[PDB]
Amino acid sequence: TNYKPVANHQYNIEYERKKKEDGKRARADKQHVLDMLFSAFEKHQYYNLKDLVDITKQPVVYLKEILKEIGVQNVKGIHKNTWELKPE
């Protein structure tokens, strides 16, 4: 019933993926990221934070700071803290 495996097979598979894309990324070129975010904002005035996280390789915390600068998060009553361009 009980074998002697060293590294569980499931654990070894995630490792290669976790290595391939080292977690998230670094913190730079915010203006270049802003132009890409603006193209996404044109597609939808309010954009889900999780969808933006998929769009940007950079870490969520760094992305949130850029998103807060462009506009205040608005819940919209649907949750997800949708991000919209500031009226100013």
């Binding site: 270049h32 890409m36 193209s39 044109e42 597609k43 939808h44 769009i55 390789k57």
Partner: protein, 56 residues
């Protein structure tokens, strides 16, 4: 250059089609998401071309 200008005027008819595209901006969303992916790919490839220029 006047033929060039009238070709530009048909491009302006294409831009009236682009005003329809301004009304356009679902399937259009998937295509523009593909365009965002393409813009990231283009930044990466421009950096690759900069590397090729060092090779040049």
């Amino acid at each position: 250059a006047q033929l060039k200008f009238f070709e530009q005027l048909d491009q302006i008819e294409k831009q009236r089609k682009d005003e329809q595209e301004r009304e356009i901006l679902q399937l259009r969303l998937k295509q523009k998401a593909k365009e965002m992916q393409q813009q990231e790919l283009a930044q990466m490839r421009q950096r690759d071309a900069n590397l090729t220029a060092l090779a040049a």
